[PDB]
């Protein structure tokens, strides 16, 4: 029961996390208009999206290279 | 102070591994080094803790050694790339290595930590945001 | 802008947005996009030339001589 | 049917019309470009949505755009 | 916890950061990118933009959520 | 007069200037790189000679010169095997004790603990146990010492240099005309009588004069040092007379057609040598001698220059209605007329046929070498026997897929509608919907009546209803036709009655007639077929038919279909024709090869799994003094292979114990490669499941970071093309899966074989 | 011969020389000093 | 009715289906200077006659591919026409629409589905919510 309950709620958590970002993307296309959000904190995020995505790529690359590299070394 | 980690020479589990090890080049010297310098867990294998004020050089030496080499490679590539931007056909200098240019870039990259510092201070390290290709928002 | 000028593209949807091109010719007629600009980097279609209007360009370096 | 739109950045190179496999596009007189012609899409009911016209368009960004819409027998390319 | 727990947490960190990278990149690029500057006019879920401009398979923001489910499951 | 040699003199200067011009062979690539796609395109089009130029004569010259280069590569590889078997092997120790020494010809250095891979293979030697069967091949050839292997290694390097010089000479100095390459009759005559015929005759001479006397002494038990060198059997005729009395009367019986007196060394026994478990070398000598005569006779079949012979064009023009059999006249009044145009101009069409027949030859090699083991101490070397069958099965599958691939290339590029007007090729294309629809149906019928019956078995077994299963103890499916063939072939030799009286022993003991044991291990015994064998054979029929369906749909629809009628104009290799018409992804003939590779892998994986489990379960094993055989897996196949839970548990889970527990042992490399194959398979899945649109957009952000630090490259980074991403995915998928099976097979056989 | 020298500066050729040289340096480091580990580099042999 | 004689063809499985009799059908007619072999749009080879020819095709793309990539490009035939034939017998000529090939500019052709702006000036979908207007159709 303990194993089933932990796995059940963790997997549901993963699906809910995916859905939160999925409907975030739907918001950008359907509901976001730059005129009413000009200059605010939501607009600033879109303005440096390249820095956000590239740095997320760097963290992913660093973790993947060294975690896998240390596993196969062992 | 961490108590579950003890010197490997004092670990009974590590000693059992030392005697059972094969008598080859790969085990005679390395076990002697591990016993004197490493800390071993209950399993008898060396463990690397980051909670000791002492043996801080054992952490900083490999970290600094890598960061210098990695920065050396990066600075060599960066300086070489910026040198070929002034050429008429920069793409051909990326599939054909310009050896005199590469040697100049490598020689300067020895002092890359100093070069990068003046590069950042003079504002020549980064390009301005509005002078960089970007996608529509 | 004029022939030989160095310009910065301001068209948002252009592949060369905020990039630098070289003016090849300017059309004197009343066409919508008379300025022809050539670029060192090709776009995703392999094309390195495009037509722009005056308000979509920023002069950053006058032509030589 | 699919929707094909032509924007004012067209240079009248007729490449999109030549690439269309179902004769959706044709070249019409115009005054907005040096070629004195612009692409038109009078027969979008025959458009399959292959986007060959977009591939042939040299302008940046595209002067011709295809927006896939409601699917019909001929827009799905069905011989049956 | 010991060294074995150290490596698996960093593997979990790799999974969290990559799944976030796929989702965030899809959300922030949902409105458009250099490859497709007018993505917002095509909606959240569309197949592609054809083989032109090098090919645009899995370019929609829906496809990023599609790809992120694989990483979320992993 | 018609057949003659015409060449050009110095057609291409020998200069290294073009070495510094990458992509010179292509007009687009010659301009230089602008994006990273240029680099990939340079390697992808490197050997596509028909896109370098439209001149057929120039293309053919490139084919001829490149083939010499590949021959040089093979000679270097062959020289390596002989040299490593002469310098870093235990070949001499193995020859003394073939049944107690594991062959080994690879020795690793000791730097990072990898010397643990130097296994204790016996004979006072430490190294990696090889499974290529080189030692058994060399012993059958009469090689007894490492010096002879060393000489062969030197000869291999010399032939490699000669091959390399020939390619340069026949491209840069004397390049034959197009008409030279179009001599079908001359080429067939020379390659039948001169290549196959004279090679068989030459090897028959080596077997008779060298291999037979040396191996006869070896099986008699005399030591290596006491066996005279092979040339002594030629000089000292008395030595050959003692072993074979017929050699005392010279060549007189051969020239007087009294060949029956040669029966002492040209035998017709069949069966296996009891001492070694391989085929009788005297049997193979008569086999190759008979082949030499048959091939040489076949080499006088085509008319070259003296009026005598047959013409290719006349046969093909005659094979049409109403000149065919009454029920074969449906091929139409044109028939094979016009097919000669294909062989005049299409290199791809010939490559398609030849790759297919190399698949056929390699499949026959795999099947006929385990049931009739031709080398001494090969059958009882279970690691080598499994490796040889598996290797040549995989080679055949790749060759067959290549045949279908270049068949589709011919259709797109070389096919001319004017040459094929109502002929058989035109008619085949005109009822391709008949062919594909029937093939699709039979694939569905085979899938339901082969695999879904396994699922029926799994459900019945889980229900606790074994009586309702398809098994020998439930609802039986006896392969009566295959069982009947085994009885006919066994009774043919005397073990529909005695139809081959001259054969003493059964042609193969797999069909019946008895068991052969060599070193306390089974060499070959009858392979009984039951319900489990009925089910698994129809699994092979299902997987093969589907693989045919994928490839043959691509070839028949390469020019176009009802969806995209102008696919030929789009080319052989293109990603799609846009999202229109509902979506036209993977319509190209190349994508059918890409999909067919997966189905070939699926088909062949079950073939080598069927071989591995059945041979371990019912053939291989140890024999005690009483003649009782205990098999490697103890007869699991009959009851466990009828469900894929049994395949999952008793084959994959159970037999992976060796590879999964190989850490801290000499087999640990197989354990590492077992995980390595699993990694590459999962790695390939992102190239197959994703698209380049996502990756190009991701590269945009990364490029922004490099632009921010003034370190962006001039050669603009691009995501792999749609086709390139598919090629990477299938390449890593097949590599990962095959390597995983390779480690799984070899680790187990190196431990229990 | 000048074309051969230009070919030797090709990216695949130079990369192969660089990787081979680095692998050689790393390989000899394993031969001369096997078993080097974090917390052990640049320390005398006991 | 449409005049012309069909090319020599022994039959095939890529021809017309129920859709031809139920919904619509297409016919391509042309004139050739000689009798010669061409490729059928759905596989196989056919022989076009000396005089005027008439071919029945399931889809309009078959006629455009045959007339464009084969008749004009290979056989230098430029007088081909494509008709749409309905089951009730109504026939309309659809290619070329006005007697001039679409790739050649012709006077009198109106601008259809033209947007008087660059593609980057399309309004965001948020401003057109619940209005039923797509951004590319916005004025
Ligand atoms: C009896 C004559 C003869 C022989 C033996 C061959 C043999 C061969 N030809 Mg060939 N050919 C011949 C006549 C002959 N040809 C004629 C008359 C023509 C013109 C119509 C051609 C046109 C032709 C083409 C167009 C091509 C070949 C190719 C090949 C090779 C096929 C690959 C193979 O099976 O590897 C066999 C592997 C071997 C190691 C065989 C040995 C190779 C050497 C060269 C044989 C030397 C034999 C010689 C008599 C010396 C014997 C010494 C000793 C035994 C006494 C093979 C070496 C193909 C190839 O790969 O070209 C390089 C190819 O593309 N041939
Ligand atoms: C006698 C055998 C033979 C010959 C002469 C050819 C010749 C040709 N083939 Mg072909 N082919 C063959 C067998 C053969 N093939 C087989 C058996 C298959 C089935 C797999 C194919 C499948 C095939 C396809 C699908 C295509 C060709 C194409 C071509 C043409 C271009 C060659 C090319 O792209 O360079 C090869 C260039 C490469 C970069 C390939 C090398 C990469 C390989 C896959 C790596 C393999 C991994 C390695 C073995 C193991 C791991 C290595 C390690 C480092 C990890 C050329 C006419 C292409 C074409 O356009 O034809 C007109 C094409 O699209 N062939
Ligand atoms: C492996 C992940 C996992 C695991 C172990 C569990 C475990 C559990 N879930 Mg669960 N769940 C998960 C993922 C998981 N969940 C996800 C991702 C969803 C979203 C769809 C749900 C939705 C869900 C619901 C709606 C319910 C549960 C319930 C339960 C509990 C009883 C069922 C059981 O014995 O386990 C599950 C055992 C399994 C072997 C899981 C596979 C079951 C089938 C075969 C999966 C395929 C479904 C179907 C055949 C395909 C479509 C038709 C148990 C604590 C029940 C509960 O709360 O109990 C009162 C309940 O009503 N779950
Ligand atoms: C409270 C939670 C919640 C709510 C209210 C919504 C609501 C919505 N989502 Mg959403 N979503 C959620 C959670 C939620 N989602 C989560 C957790 C994820 C991550 C997996 C997503 C991922 C997601 C995507 C990727 C998309 C949406 C879309 C949508 C909108 C249209 C729904 C649709 O496509 O028609 C109804 C859809 C279905 C009925 C789907 C069929 C069922 C799927 C295939 C599951 C397979 C069935 C499975 C075997 C058994 C499930 C149980 C069975 C009883 C059904 C709608 C506003 C779509 C949208 O707005 O388009 C622009 C869209 O593209 N969502
Ligand atoms: C085993 C399977 C597997 C593996 C290893 C990866 C690995 C990776 N994926 Mg991935 N992916 C997979 C399956 C897999 N994926 C599947 C099935 C999907 C669903 C379609 C995805 C979807 C997906 C998305 C959507 C994204 C990734 C991303 C990434 C990268 C982030 C992790 C990282 O940087 O680590 C470090 C890198 C690695 C661990 C890769 C292996 C490096 C090797 C081992 C180095 C060896 C070098 C050696 C000399 C090579 C030998 C020579 C050879 C060339 C012949 C990484 C390259 C993200 C990315 O690109 O972020 C930057 C990203 O956005 N993937
Ligand atoms: C020329 C050297 C160079 C330099 C200074 C950088 C610098 C950077 N890269 Mg980068 N990169 C390079 C080459 C280089 N790259 C190459 C060749 C590739 C293709 C494999 C990549 C692929 C790449 C990705 C996918 C990502 C970066 C990222 C980054 C940023 C942080 C992470 C990092 O250092 O990369 C770590 C290094 C790598 C990921 C691989 C580079 C290793 C290559 C093989 C070394 C090549 C050396 C070169 C041949 C030297 C020749 C010089 C000679 C002629 C004198 C940083 C701005 C990340 C980013 O945007 O962060 C914000 C990111 O996500 N890079
Ligand atoms: C029917 C052909 C045939 C057969 C059955 C054999 C059989 C044998 N050879 Mg042999 N050989 C042959 C032809 C053949 N040879 C030819 C043509 C040459 C070169 C001229 C040689 C050269 C040779 C050497 C040098 C050696 C052997 C050896 C052997 C033995 C080891 C087993 C083996 O090679 O695999 C058996 C192979 C097969 C079952 C299949 C391969 C046969 C060919 C490739 C199939 C051709 C048919 C094709 C698929 C259809 C063509 C299309 C059609 C329209 C015509 C065995 C007795 C070895 C030995 O001494 O053993 C003790 C050895 O050292 N052979
Ligand atoms: C095709 C290759 C080949 C070659 C090079 C030789 C070469 C030789 N054979 Mg030989 N032989 C061959 C095939 C071959 N044979 C075959 C296929 C048979 C079976 C019919 C024989 C049967 C045979 C007999 C019976 C004898 C020779 C003998 C000889 C030697 C003297 C022959 C002479 O000059 O007259 C000579 C070394 C004679 C010899 O000196 O014995 C060692 C001898 O008595 N051979
Ligand atoms: C295990 C996974 C799996 C399965 C079951 C299938 C099944 C099928 N593939 Mg397929 N495929 C797969 C993986 C799989 N594929 C993968 C990974 C690839 C990538 C390479 C492909 C690539 C591929 C191609 C390229 C082709 C196929 C084809 C086929 C069909 C072959 C005809 C057949 O067997 O009909 C019988 C059907 C089955 C055996 C499926 C299982 C049925 C179960 C066991 C019984 C169900 C009982 C009952 C009906 C259930 C109803 C209950 C109700 C409540 C639903 C069939 C639908 C071919 C095709 O369509 O030919 C006609 C074809 O051309 N596939
Ligand atoms: C991951 C991925 C990419 C991204 C992959 C790219 C851009 C290719 C990258 C190749 C690299 C640059 C080759 C070199 C990698 C080596 C591991 C580097 C060795 C470095 C030494 C120092 C060790 C695609 O472009 C793509 C396109 C279409 C379908 C699927 C995919 C896909 O899955
Ligand atoms: S291809 Fe583009 S630029 Fe050329 S005519 Fe068509 S829409 Fe205008
Ligand atoms: S292959 Fe890619 S670009 Fe082509 S139709 Fe399919 S998804 Fe779109």
Q: What is the dihedral of CA G15, G21, G26, G28, to 10 degrees?
A: 160
Helix, strand, coil in percent for chain H, rounding step 5: 20, 25, 55
Instruction: Tell me how far the alpha carbon of residue D54 lies from the centroid of ligand 12, in angstroms.
Output: 14
Q: Is F95 helix (H, G, I), strand (E, B) or coil?
A: helix
Using only C-alpha atoms, chain D has a radius of gyration, in whole angstroms, of 13
Task: Find chain B residues with C-beta within 8 A of G40's C-beta.
Answer: 33-34, 37-38, 58
B6-7 and F629-631 strand pairing: unpaired
Q: Which atom of ligand 6 has the smallest separation from the CA of F702? A: 60
CB of residue D9 inside a 6 A radius of ligand 11:
no
The encoded tokens of residue F112 equal: 């990072």
Centre of ligand 9 to C-alpha F408, Å, is: 25
Ligand 7 neighbourhood includes F365 CB (under 6 angstroms): yes
Task: Give the number of other CB atoms < 10 A from CB of residue E44.
Answer: 21
Q: Residue B85 corresponds to which tokens in the numbers above?
A: 């931007």
Angle at which helices F589-618 and F382-409 pack, to 10 degrees? 160
User: At C6, phi and psi to the nearest 5?
Assistant: -100, 120
Give chain F's length.
753
Give long-range contacts, CB 8 A cutoff, 24+ apart: F142-147: F142/F206, F142/F210, F142/F211, F142/F213, F142/F214, F142/F215, F142/F230, F144/F95, F144/F214, F144/F218, F144/F224, F144/F227, F145/F92, F145/F224, F146/F85, F146/F86, F146/F87, F146/F89, F146/F91, F146/F92, F147/F86
Polymer length of chain E: 74
Measured from the Cβ of residue H74, the count of other Cβ atoms closer than 10 Å reads 11
Phi, psi dihedral angles at D21 (to 5 degrees): -85, -5
Distances (CA, A) of C60 to C8, C13, C48, C54, F222: 7, 20, 19, 13, 94
Distance CA H97, CA H106 (A): 11
Q: Is the CB of D6 under 6 A from ligand 11?
A: yes
For residue H125, which ligand has an atom nearest its CA?
Answer: 4
Inter-residue contact F484 to F502 (CB < 8 Å): no
Of the candidates D11, D34, D61, the beta carbon closest to that of C14 is on D61
Residue of B nearest to C58 (CA): B131
Cis peptide before D61 (omega within 30 of 0): yes
Contacts 24+ apart (CB under 8 A), B9-17: B9/B35, B9/B36, B11/B40, B11/B41, B11/B44, B12/B44, B13/B40, B13/B42, B13/B43, B13/B44, B14/B40, B14/B44, B14/B45, B14/B46, B15/B44, B16/B44, B17/B44, B17/B45
Beta strands of F29-88 (E only): which ranges? none
Nearest to D39 by CA among D4, D2, D68, D75: D4
In the numeric block, which tokens belong to residue F590? 């190349």
Q: Report yes or no: F332 and F422 within 8 Å, Cβ to Cβ.
A: yes
In a 13 Å sphere around the CA of A11, the CA atoms on its Cβ side amount to 9
Q: Is F720 a pocket residue for ligand 10 (Cβ < 6 Å)? A: yes
Whether the bond between F322 and the residue before it is cis, its omega within 30 degrees of 0, is: yes
Q: What are phi and psi of F522, to 5 degrees?
A: -75, 125
Q: Do chains D and F touch (3 or more CB pairs under 8 A)?
A: yes
- Residue F271 contacts residue F283 (beta carbons within 8 Å): no
Which of C17, C43, C56 has the highest number of chain B CBs within 10 A, making it the mutation to test binding with B? C17
* Preceding amide of H96 cis, omega within 30: yes
Q: Long-range contacts made by residues H125-134, C-beta under 8 angstroms, separation at least 24?
A: H125/A29, H125/A30, H125/E40, H125/E41, H126/A30, H126/A31, H126/A32, H126/A33, H127/A33, H127/A35, H129/A30, H129/A31, H134/D3, H134/D67, H134/E41
Q: Quick one: which H or E segment has residue A14?
A: helix A2-30
Burial letters F706-742, b for 16+ CB under 10 A, else e: ebbebbbebbbebbbbbbbbbbbbbebbbbbbbbbbb
Contact D51/E at CB under 8 A: yes
Q: Do residues F517 and F630 touch, judged by C-beta distance below 8 A?
A: no
DSSP 8-state secondary structure symbol assigned to residue F716: B
Rounded to whole angstroms, how far apart are CA atoms F244 and F228?
16
Residue D55 CA to residue E46 CA, distance in Å, equals: 18
Pocket residue to mutate for ligand 1, from F2, F59, F66, F71, most atoms within 8 A of Cβ: F71
Q: Give yes or no for a contact between F410 and F352, defined as CB atoms under 8 angstroms apart.
A: yes
Name the minimum distance, in Å, from the CA of D71 to any CA of chain H: 16
Give the one of E49, E54, E64 whose C-beta lies nearest to F694's C-beta.
Answer: E64
Q: How far is CA E71 from the centre of its chain?
A: 9
Measured between alpha carbons, how far is H101 from H95 in angstroms, rounded to an integer? Answer: 8
Ramachandran category for residue D69: left, alpha or beta (phi over 0 → left; psi -120 to 50 → alpha) = beta
Nearest CA in chain D to H96: D23
Q: Do residues F269 and F495 touch, judged by C-beta distance below 8 A?
A: no
Per this entry, what is the length of chain G? 46
Q: Which residues of C23-44 are buried (b: 16+ CB within 10 A; e: fewer)?
A: beeeeeeebbbbbbbebebebb
Residue F70 near ligand 7, beta carbon < 6 Å: no
**D3-7 and H114-115: which strand pairing?**
parallel
Q: Which of F87, F93, F124 is nearest to F105 (CA)?
A: F87
Q: Give residue for tokens 């290709």.
A: B133
For F382-509, where are the alpha helices, taking DSSP H only?
382-409, 424-430, 432-462, 480-492
Helix (H) or strand (E) holding F37, with range, is helix F37-44
F663 is in an annotated binding site: no
CB contact, 8 Å: E54 with chain B? no
Per the CB < 8 A criterion, the answer to whether F185 and F302 are in contact is: yes
F116 burial via Cβ count (<10 Å: 0-12, 13-18, 19+): middle
Closest CA to F176 of F8, F410, F392, F366: F8
| Best residue of E55, E69, E74 to probe chain F, by most F CBs closer than 10 Å | E55
Question: Residue H54: enclosing H or E segment and its boundaries?
Answer: strand H52-57
d(CA F298, CA F191): 10
Query: Is H in contact with A (3 or more beta carbon pairs below 8 Å)?
Result: yes
CB of H95 closer than 8 Å to CB of H84? no
Chains C and B touch (3+ CB pairs under 8 A): yes
Q: Are strands H45-48 and H52-57 parallel, antiparallel or unpaired?
A: unpaired
Copy the structure tokens of residue B32. 């002697």
C-alpha separations of F700 from A54, E54, F547 in Å: 9, 14, 39
3-class DSSP state of D6 = strand
Question: Chain E contact for B3, CB < 8 A?
Answer: no
- Rounded alpha-carbon distances, angstroms, from residue F709 to B75, C16, E19: 11, 18, 27
Across F133-145, b (16+ Cβ under 10 Å) vs e yields bbbbebbbbbbbe
**Which candidate in C13, C32, C33 is best for mutational testing of the H interface (most H CBs within 10 A)?**
C13
Q: What is the DSSP string of F629-650?
A: EEESS-S-HHHHTTSHHHIIII
Distance CA H117, CA H9 (A): 51
3-state SS, residue F601? helix
Tell me the sheet residues that pair with B39. B7, B47
Residue with tokens 């390249």: A50
Size of interface F-G (CB pairs under 8 A): 21
Taking the CA of F407 as reference, the closest ligand is: 2
> F705: CA distance to ligand 6 center in Å?
10
H81-85: strand order across its sheet = H52-57, H25-31, H81-85, H91-95
Asked if F321 and F329 touch (Cβ cutoff 8 Å), the reply is yes
For chain B, the maximum distance between any two Cα atoms, rounded to a whole number of angstroms, is 69
Candidates F32, F65, F30, F33; CA nearest to F47 is F65
Q: Which F residues, 520 through 579, put their C-beta within 8 Å of a C-beta on chain D?
A: 562-564, 566, 577-579
Q: Which two tokens stand for residue B5?
A: 């980690």
How many CA atoms lie within 13 Å of F273's alpha carbon, on the beta-carbon side?
Answer: 26
Is the minimum CB–CB distance between C55 and chain H shorter than 8 Å?
Answer: no
Beta bridge partners of residue F738, listed in sequence order? none
How many other β-carbons are positioned within 10 Å of the β-carbon of residue F237? 11
> Is residue B74 within 6 Å of ligand 6 at its C-beta?
yes
Does F420 carry a binding-site annotation?
no
Q: What is the resolution of this structure in A?
A: 1.9
Q: In whole angstroms, what is the distance from residue H68 CA to residue H63 CA?
A: 8
Element (H, E) at F342: helix F339-345
Q: How many alpha carbons lie under 13 Å from residue F436 in its C-beta half-sphere?
A: 17
Report which protein residue has its CA nearest ligand 6's atom 40: A61
- Give the whole-angstrom CA distance, residue F671 versus residue F679: 13
Smallest Cβ–Cβ distance between C45 and the set E34, E37, E52 belongs to E52
d(CA F673, CA F741): 10
Closest CA to E54 of F603, G36, C45: C45
F487 is in an annotated binding site: no
F182 phi, psi to nearest 5 deg? -90, 15
| Residue F677: closest CA among F691, F696, F656 | F656
CA distance F176 to F8: 6
Residue F8's DSSP bridge partners are: F175
Query: By the 8 A CB rule, do B137 and B104 touch?
Result: no
Q: Scan for tokens 């992804």, then name that residue.
A: F585
C-alpha of residue F195 to centroid of ligand 1, in Å: 7
Nearest residue in B to G36, CA atom: B30
Is the minimum CB–CB distance between F165 and chain E shorter than 8 Å?
no
Q: Is A61 in the pocket of ligand 5 (CB under 6 A)?
A: yes
Answer yes or no: do B133 and C8 touch at CB < 8 A: no
Chain B nearest CA to F700, separation (Å): 8
Q: How far is CA F240 from the centre of its chain?
A: 38
């Amino acid at each position: 029961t303990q194993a089933a309950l932990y796995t059940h709620h963790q997997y549901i958590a993963g699906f809910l996390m995916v859905g939160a970002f999925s409907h975030a993307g739907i918001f950008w296309i359907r509901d976001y208009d730059p005129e009413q959000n000009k200059g605010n904190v939501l607009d600033r995020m879109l303005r440096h999206k390249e820095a956000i995505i590239s740095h997320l790529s760097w963290v992913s690359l660093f973790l993947g290279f060294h975690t896998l590299g240390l596993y196969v070394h062992n | 102070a961490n108590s579950t980690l003890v010197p490997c020479s004092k670990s009974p589990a590590f000693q059992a591994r030392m005697k059972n090890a094969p008598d080859t080049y790969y085990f005679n010297k390395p076990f002697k080094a591990y016993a004197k310098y490493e800390l071993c867990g209950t399993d008898g294998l060396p463990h690397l803790p980051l909670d000791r004020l002492d043996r801080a050089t054992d952490v900083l030496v490999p970290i600094g050694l890598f960061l210098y080499v990695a920065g050396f490679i990066g600075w060599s590539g960066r300086s070489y790339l910026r040198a070929t931007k002034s050429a008429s056909d920069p793409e051909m200098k990326e599939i054909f290595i310009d050896l005199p240019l590469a040697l100049q870039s490598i020689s300067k990259a020895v002092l890359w930590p100093l070069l990068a510092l003046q590069e950042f201070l003079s504002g020549d390290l980064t390009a301005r945001d509005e002078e960089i290709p970007i996608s529509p928002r | 802008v004029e022939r030989g000028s160095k310009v910065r593209i301001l068209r948002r949807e252009s592949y060369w947005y905020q990039d630098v091109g070289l003016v090849a010719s300017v059309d004197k007629s009343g066409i919508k996009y008379p300025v022809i600009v050539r670029f060192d980097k090709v776009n995703y279609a392999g094309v390195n030339t495009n037509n722009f209007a005056d308000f979509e360009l920023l002069e950053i370096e006058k032509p030589k001589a | 049917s699919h929707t094909v739109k032509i924007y004012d950045t067209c240079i009248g190179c007729t490449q999109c019309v030549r690439a269309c496999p179902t004769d959706v596009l044709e070249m019409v007189p115009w005054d907005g470009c040096k070629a004195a012609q612009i692409a038109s899409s009078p027969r979008t009911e025959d458009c399959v949505g292959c986007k060959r016209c977009e591939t042939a368009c040299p302008t940046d960004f595209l002067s011709i755009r295809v927006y896939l819409g409601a699917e019909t027998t001929r827009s799905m390319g069905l011989a049956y | 916890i010991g060294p074995g727990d150290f490596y698996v947490h960093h593997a979990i960190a790799l999974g969290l950061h990559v799944t976030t990278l796929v989702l965030v990149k899809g959300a922030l690029d949902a409105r458009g990118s250099k490859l497709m500057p007018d993505k917002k006019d095509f909606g959240y879920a569309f197949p592609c933009d054809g083989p032109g401009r090098g090919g645009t398979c899995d370019i929609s923001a829906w496809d990023a959520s599609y790809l992120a489910v694989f990483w979320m499951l992993n | 007069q018609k057949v003659r040699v015409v060449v050009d003199n110095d057609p291409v200067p020998t200069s290294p200037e073009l070495w510094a011009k990458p992509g010179h062979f292509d007009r687009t690539l010659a301009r230089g790189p602008k994006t990273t796609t240029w680099i990939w395109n340079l390697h992808a089009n490197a050997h596509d000679f028909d896109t370098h130029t439209s001149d057929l004569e120039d293309i053919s010259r490139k084919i001829f010169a490149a083939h010499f280069g590949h021959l040089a590569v093979i000679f270097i590889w062959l020289s390596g095997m002989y040299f490593h078997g002469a310098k870093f092997s235990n070949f001499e120790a193995w020859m003394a004790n073939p049944t107690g020494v594991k062959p080994s010809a690879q020795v690793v250095w000791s730097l990072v603990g990898q010397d643990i891979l130097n296994a204790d293979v016996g004979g006072g030697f430490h190294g990696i146990q090889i499974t290529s069967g080189l030692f058994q091949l060399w012993r059958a050839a009469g090689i007894t010492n490492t010096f002879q292997l060393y000489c062969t290694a030197i000869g291999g390097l010399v032939m490699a240099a000669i091959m390399l010089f020939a390619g340069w000479f026949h491209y840069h100095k004397r390049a034959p005309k197009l008409e030279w390459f179009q001599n079908w009759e001359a080429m067939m005559n020379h390659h039948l009588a001169g290549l196959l015929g004279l090679g068989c005759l030459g090897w028959a001479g080596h077997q008779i004069h060298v291999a037979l006397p040396v191996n006869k002494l070896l099986d008699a038990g005399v030591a290596i040092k006491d066996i005279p060198l092979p040339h002594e059997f030629i000089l000292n005729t008395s030595l050959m007379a003692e072993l074979y009395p017929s050699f005392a009367k010279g060549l007189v019986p051969f020239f007087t057609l009294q060949w029956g007196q040669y029966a002492d060394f040209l035998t017709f026994k069949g069966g296996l040598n009891p001492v070694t478990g391989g085929l009788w070398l005297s049997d193979t000598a008569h086999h190759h001698l008979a082949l030499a005569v048959l091939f040489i006779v076949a080499g006088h079949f085509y008319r070259t220059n003296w009026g005598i012979g047959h013409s290719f064009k006349e046969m093909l023009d005659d094979a049409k209605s109403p000149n065919m059999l009454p029920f074969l006249n449906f091929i139409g009044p044109v028939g094979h007329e016009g097919l000669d145009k294909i062989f005049e101009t299409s290199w791809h069409a010939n490559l398609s046929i030849h790759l297919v027949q190399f698949g056929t030859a390699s499949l026959l090699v795999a099947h006929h070498m385990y049931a009739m083991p031709p080398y001494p101490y090969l059958a009882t070397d279970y690691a080598t026997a499994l490796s040889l069958f598996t290797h040549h099965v995989w080679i055949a599958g790749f060759c067959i897929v290549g045949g279908a691939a270049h068949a589709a290339i011919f259709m797109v590029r070389d096919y001319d509608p004017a040459h094929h007007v109502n002929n058989i090729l035109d008619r085949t294309l005109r009822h391709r919907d008949v062919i594909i629809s029937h093939l699709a149906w039979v694939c569905q019928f085979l899938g339901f009546h082969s695999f879904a019956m396994y699922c029926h078995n799994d459900t019945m077994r889980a229900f606790g209803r074994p009586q309702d299963m398809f098994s020998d103890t439930g609802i039986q499916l006896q392969p009566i036709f295959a069982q009947w063939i085994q009885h006919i072939h066994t009774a043919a030799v005397g073990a529909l009655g005695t139809t081959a009286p001259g054969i003493g022993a059964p042609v193969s003991y797999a069909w019946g007639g008895g068991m052969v044991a060599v070193g306390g291990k089974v060499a070959m015994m009858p392979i009984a077929l039951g319900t489990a064998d009925f089910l698994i054979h129809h699994i092979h029929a299902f997987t093969i038919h589907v693989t045919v369906l994928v490839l043959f749909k691509g070839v028949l629809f390469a020019r176009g279909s009802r969806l995209v009628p102008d696919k030929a104009n789009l080319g052989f290799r293109f990603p799609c024709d846009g999202p229109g018409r509902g979506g036209t992804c993977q319509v190209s003939a190349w994508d059918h090869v890409f999909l067919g590779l997966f189905w070939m892998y699926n088909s062949l994986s079950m073939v080598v799994f069927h071989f591995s489990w059945k041979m371990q379960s019912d053939v291989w094993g140890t024999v005690d003094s009483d003649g009782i055989v205990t098999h490697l897996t103890g007869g699991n196949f009959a009851t466990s292979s009828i469900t894929n839970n049994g395949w999952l548990r008793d084959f994959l889970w159970a037999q992976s114990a060796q590879v999964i527990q190989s850490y801290n042992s000499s087999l640990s490399a197989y354990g590492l490669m077992f995980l390595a194959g699993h990694f590459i398979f999962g790695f390939s899945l992102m190239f197959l499941f994703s698209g380049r649109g996502y990756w190009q957009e991701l590269i945009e952000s990364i490029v922004w970071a490099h632009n921010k630090l003034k370190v962006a490259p001039a050669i603009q980074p691009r995501a792999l093309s749609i086709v390139h991403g598919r090629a990477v995915g299938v390449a890593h998928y097949l590599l990962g899966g095959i390597v995983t099976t390779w480690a799984f097979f070899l680790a187990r056989m190196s431990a229990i074989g | 011969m000048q074309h051969v020298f230009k070919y030797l500066t090709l990216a695949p050729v130079m990369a192969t020389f660089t990787m081979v040289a680095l692998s050689v340096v790393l390989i000899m480091l394993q031969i001369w000093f096997p078993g080097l580990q974090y917390g052990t580099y640049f320390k005398p042999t006991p | 009715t449409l005049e012309g004689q069909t090319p020599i063809f022994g039959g095939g499985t890529g021809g017309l289906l129920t859709k031809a009799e139920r919904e619509e059908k297409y016919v391509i007619t042309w004139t050739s200077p000689k009798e010669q072999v061409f490729e059928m749009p759905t596989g196989g080879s056919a022989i076009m006659r000396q005089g005027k020819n008439k071919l029945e095709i399931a889809r309009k793309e078959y006629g455009i591919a045959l007339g464009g990539q084969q008749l004009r490009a290979k056989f230098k035939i430029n007088d081909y026409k494509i008709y749409r034939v309905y089951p009730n017998g109504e026939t309309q000529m659809i290619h070329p629409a006005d007697g001039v090939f679409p790739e050649k500019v012709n006077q009198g052709r109106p601008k259809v589905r033209y947007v008087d702006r660059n593609i980057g000036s399309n309004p965001s979908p948020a401003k057109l919510k619940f209005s039923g207007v797509q951004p590319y159709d916005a004025p």
